[PDB]
Design a binder for this molecule. Structure first.
Ligand code: FES
Length: 101
């Protein structure tokens, strides 16, 4: 898998997310304070933030490719296309920016 360090409001943890399996599976495995939702992309409140590396969230709701470069991504239907660091609870970041990055 790819090693993605999820940045949670409680800290950070490196998970192993397969190139076929969405981050949240490995994310919850790692022990994050990450909720569980649809895994189908019915919303974007559970939108992770690509702090580092990259992931596959092309079919994200109202998030665009540029947002991924900005470091804004989806946790439900996305997984690392490389080893990365992914912020969790920063859903707003796609909506505005959250001023994190
Ligand atoms: S629950 Fe609908 S996208 Fe996470």
């Amino acid at each position: 898998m790819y090693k993605v360090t999820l940045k949670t409001p409680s800290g950070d943890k490196t998970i192993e997310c397969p190139a076929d399996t969405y981050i949240l599976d490995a994310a919850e495995e790692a022990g994050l304070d990450l909720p569980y939702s649809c895994r189908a992309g019915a919303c974007s409140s559970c939108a992770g933030k690509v702090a580092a590396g990259t992931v596959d969230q092309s079919d994200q709701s109202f998030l665009d490719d540029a947002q991924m470069g900005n470091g804004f991504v989806l946790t439900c239907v996305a997984y690392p296309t490389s080893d990365c660091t992914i912020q969790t609870h920063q859903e707003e970041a796609l909506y505005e920016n959250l001023y994190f990055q």
